[PDB]
Symmetry: D2
Subunit: 431 residues, 4 copies
């Protein structure tokens, strides 16, 4: 067992830090003057253009598929550096990565070649989005006997027709509400959308993923695809994740990701399990920013006392708990991503590890930011420090990419409940 970083892992960090410091620090001056979510998002376009130019979008795609991703650990390192400085743009990169993943994970080389092309070219500002979440919620999308996804699709001739609404998926409307360059739309197959999901059929068998592009949207009537709204968010105020309605929206059969059913569900689950693990690096980044700002402050400020405040046990106890939370978090993220990369391991073992990671890292980052604020004191409450921004941004993490209470805990629970569950298979191997 080994924790040493390769020169390429160290270079990835250096590269990521430099990008964050020289480019991402300039974003605030641009987006701060904009007075709604979309305007703020549009104001980050030149930074994502720079991200593309720096090869960061290409680094979201595995090398066998023509990308530049060296490993998930490299990716983890990069995301922590980006998020420790500025989630603006950084969030758009990971959202794109997630949007690309169903394609990256499917086993069709020609679909891959076709749809990944703009993302590996190193040019423009191509956006991807995994359009799963809905206005009515999704924690119970797989519940047998429940309503299921409210976005449904039916086959009509050589075409699929999408009806319903998505809400939350980052990048989904593109820069201009004419659509992301690639959206993966998750639907429940239904021949009559006005009829409830058949309670005698397993919801996972009815799942389909349809690839929707700018061209797809252009080939539809204008009111077949509409942005109804854009949520004003507590934090991550420069991201876009609109309320989209599909009305009789036509998609060619060649844009179906795979045969509807368990294989389509498996592509979604795999992608959200990859993300579950990697989201820990975003949480670490945000919390580390908090911990470091508090650490620096505590080692150079006496707060009208005679000694630096890090010398008070109560202040140091906070910084200690923060440090422990960040250290355990990163270890768990690195464990999770290498587990996911281990071909000798069963899915359920990878999934369990990925759920734990999401749950821990995201809950604990919140505590870390709040403890840092408490240690710094009143000064952390004003926007000449970064804590107000960090507080709002860190609270996204336990809620997003499938919230801990409704989704991640439940997925983990289902695995632990399995008769052949091996708690330590990822550590000591399978018996």
């Amino acid at each position: 067992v080994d924790f040493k970083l390769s020169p390429s892992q160290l270079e990835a960090r250096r590269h990521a830090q430099a990008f964050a410091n020289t480019v991402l620090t300039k974003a605030s001056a641009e987006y701060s003057t904009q007075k709604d979510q979309l305007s703020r998002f549009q104001a980050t376009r030149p930074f994502y253009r720079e991200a593309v130019r720096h090869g960061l979008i290409k680094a979201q795609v595995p090398i066998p598929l023509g990308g530049t991703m060296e490993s998930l650990v490299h990716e983890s390192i990069i995301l922590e550096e980006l998020f420790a400085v500025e989630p603006a743009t950084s969030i758009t990169i990971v959202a794109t990565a997630l949007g690309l993943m169903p394609v990256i994970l499917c086993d069709s080389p020609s679909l891959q070649e076709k749809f990944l092309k703009p993302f590996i070219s190193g040019e423009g500002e191509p956006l991807a989005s995994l359009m799963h979440s809905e206005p009515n919620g999704t924690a119970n999308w797989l519940q047998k006997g429940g309503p299921g996804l409210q976005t449904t699709a039916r086959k009509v001739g050589n075409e699929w027709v999408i009806s319903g609404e998505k809400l939350w998926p980052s990048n989904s409307g593109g820069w201009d509400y004419k659509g992301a360059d690639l959206a993966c739309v998750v639907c429940r197959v239904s021949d009559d959308p006005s009829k409830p999901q058949d309670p005698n059929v397993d919801p996972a068998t009815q799942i389909a993923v349809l690839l929707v592009t700018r061209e797809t949207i252009a080939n539809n009537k204008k009111d077949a695809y509409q942005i109804l709204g854009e949520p004003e968010l507590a934090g991550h105020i420069t991201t876009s994740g609109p309320h989209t309605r599909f009305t009789e929206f036509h998609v060619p059969h060649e844009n179906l990701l795979c045969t509807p059913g368990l294989k389509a569900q498996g592509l979604v689950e795999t992608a959200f399990a990859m993300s579950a693990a990697l989201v820990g690096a975003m949480a670490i980044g945000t919390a580390r920013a908090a911990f470091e700002e508090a650490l620096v402050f505590a080692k150079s400020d006496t707060r009208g006392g005679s000694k630096h405040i890090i010398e008070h046990q109560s202040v140091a106890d906070k910084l200690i708990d923060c440090k422990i939370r960040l250290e355990t978090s990163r270890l768990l993220v690195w464990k999770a991503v290498t587990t996911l990369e281990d071909e000798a391991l069963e899915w359920k073992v990878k999934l369990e590890m990925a759920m734990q990671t999401k749950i821990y890292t995201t809950d604990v980052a919140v505590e870390c930011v709040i403890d840092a604020m408490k240690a710094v004191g009143m000064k952390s409450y004003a926007k000449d420090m970064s804590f107000p921004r960090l507080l709002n941004e860190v609270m996204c993490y336990p809620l997003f990419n499938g919230g801990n209470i409704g989704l991640r805990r439940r997925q983990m629970q289902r695995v632990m409940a399995l008769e052949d569950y091996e708690p330590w298979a990822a550590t000591y191997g399978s018996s």
Copy 2:
């Protein structure tokens, strides 16, 4: 022992709710539109005028002093209802209350009568501020051997001269940056403001409090009193609590609140012990708003499943924890304000109770808001729900009115370490 509310307590509640619902709900339409902290504060003025007109400033001053305060439990009830709806303006009322406290608590009838008069008139929009906080911090303001307060005062003939900077005291500059109608400025006495506090004298023996009005400022050179900035805050975005510089600022000796020393410090400490307990009510208001919003949501929303999410044990667990936090918090605040009004109890028993209250209620209010969000899920993160506002507002409480880590835990620790510490005196008698 009894928990039943009297007719006037129930009516105090009815009256605070009605004012919050009919008046305070309209404030956001005005302030949200504004560009910066000061202008948001200014957009709040008509709502403070309505508060005055509803007798809510008069209710901050005891009846013997010509006010209408019925009791601290009434006060707790009012603050909870107010903050459960809208901290804007509500914050201004309680900051005024605090600014009034050292005058209320001194026993100089001529001073009370002179300086409390605008606040009991039921007219205008008079503001008070207790100016204690500084740019360099105040958690160590009484540390023997430390530099102490950096706002100092010196006697020159029949007046006092203030040299230094305050930061954070709410209302301190008034509506227009020409001053609160009354400010109590806490200074360290120093003959020479360049000489470091004498390491051999107890800092508490050097505390003075000087009363400063808009008239006091007007009678000084323009540059004697400078507003240098206005913090942009995470939450409570409509409050003013500027950065103020006093440079050779002249104050009549008759505006000195009491004799410098333990008595002046004792006034500040008592003022802040009373606020310590009452901020619990503010915390409960905010946390209660989160809990009730989450509860209604969980009882009416299935999140695309077959049952309301309250039926999921993990959701219910969060709401149970929120409910428990709120219920224990309110009990402790009422216990505290009740303990503070008990003439039979000695100061350290009251102070300890008050410290306990600020610490518990403010820490636990934050967990309550976050657990409420986690229960609601993704939808709590967007501004068409209250939670984004509540999250930012609730984090103020463990940090402000003397933060828990540096101030309140240290005050409490000092009491507990005394030889004659009686942990259960407030309950089981001395």
Copy 3:
């Protein structure tokens, strides 16, 4: 609103402390040398004898019913003082009190006068036990479609015939395994115990309570009532709560507490809601003992340093935390018992307050003891301090009298789910 204590409340406290300090402090010398649970229990009899003699058992019975209980706050004060010194015998007093509660709460004057008489007499060592808990568990006893209680009762002629097993009910076998002076035995009515509970009938409608005395047992075959074992507990090692098997045990119809059904369930629910509130006083006593020991230590010991350890912020932080938990706990207990006594409030309002109290005070008492131990340090771990006893005793409280996880949180959840739930009705009145 008022927190001042009356002379009789202050006297109740003085009396309980005096008894604890002069009688109960002597119990350790006697049970410490016994070899098993039952012997330690039996070694306790003289102290229970003294408790009776001191009026403490009579004080478990309301004044209208011939007892001397002045109120539930009085009760709370007393229990805190007892458990702050020695849970031995104290636990026997409270278990009896629970045993007496379904009789206390029925509205049959002749039954009360009859069955409560030994307990109001001021003489003997009479024990009572509410026999609810079962080897298979009881968290799901009212689950529709479940197996229900495995102790069943059927009517045969003019008597009832109990079949099944109880586990845990304190005092149930009495001092000598010939039975408690009064045992309230909760059964599920079933005509054929070898057939499963009907999944179409609400389990609450089938609940019966049969009073079983030492005479009832004497009038049965010796093998119809068997003590099969006595659990060795981590703490409260002087209590007896045996494994009891009923095999065709005949009970007179005049021993039926009420018509089987929702009234019988209601009596059990009300008994356990009252205990749920009062058990908080037990938790507070135990954790107060931990806190006071730690506090006296911190104020008198420098641990090889220059100053008393209370001067260290981290130690003080623990004690502060202990203090807050104790203070909030006792307030909540007083709130809850006063709520239970308020004739103007709906039951669900009383139930909810009672559940909250049990959940909070019991969970928080565990943290309090543990934090006290951490503050004292290594010395807390040896049996020449109270802590090792306190640790084992405190861990009982979240688990017993309806565990928090399986029972109390589920009872509270059910009330919160109701359409007419008023969160603050106990504070601000109902609408």
Copy 4:
């Protein structure tokens, strides 16, 4: 960065598992009959003999020094498996390992050759003990202006003379109160024990360590070395860490382990740093046994309901939390021991990492046992399940090997305060 275990790492786990299951499981039948701490400890002698015969003592010594230790990760894995089954004897191995450490670490191959010899032999039952802890505490042993250690040494001719008392150090009196085969006695150098430590001297400059063997004790008057008592412990009831008084105790100057002062303190610090990282493996073992018993129960018991209790969200939530705590803990220990082995890192980096690990793993192991108990419910409180023993055992860990509050948190606090503190040095390398 790699987490894969080698065949030798897998073999060490199998081996340790086989040992715990075939040998350690039998220990309880012997020690449970004994009536005091020392008797129980002596009853474990046959099992320590077996441990020597399995080469487990030899494996506490590095290969360069003639032992069989393969790595610190090997050692972590072994201690986890041992403590998961039975901390009796397992504690004695680990106490001996700590005892040997200052010798293992010193600059003297001749001292190493001489004193380690009986431990690498593979026969008998040799015990080591690092004797640092005292009746008055040690958290402030290095405080300038404080009384310092109360076990003191003066040089008298060509011998050293020990005056003072020790309390807590495991194995110190050996099997028979005639001494551990090897004991490293940590002393404060004081020409006159009657005089207070000089407030002008850095206490660290006055530290000496004297090796004391059974021979050393035999060459002294009966009352120069006396056992005043043996603490009765809450858990780990089969260890010995007695109260020891040295009255004019003579020790040859050749037995002086190194030059008194910063170098001697260095060896003690380094030894306790290593134990700090490795006690997490003990804590994990105990918590893991709690988690696994609770998991198996949750997956096979319905508690009188229609489904296994793991299906209840609240129960699963407890198991999830336990799992997360165990996973993050193990990762941290492996990171800590690997960091300790890294020759390229500054000492303070290794020290901070070891402190982190001790604090986190030990605090979180207690939470993990208590959660497992809450999930199982009332059943967990009786001694026919492991929990009562585990609860008592787990509470040792935050308190022992330098309690978290007094020692480990302050050692970490000192590191973080240093101008050149590098929080991420153990991960991302030093600047």
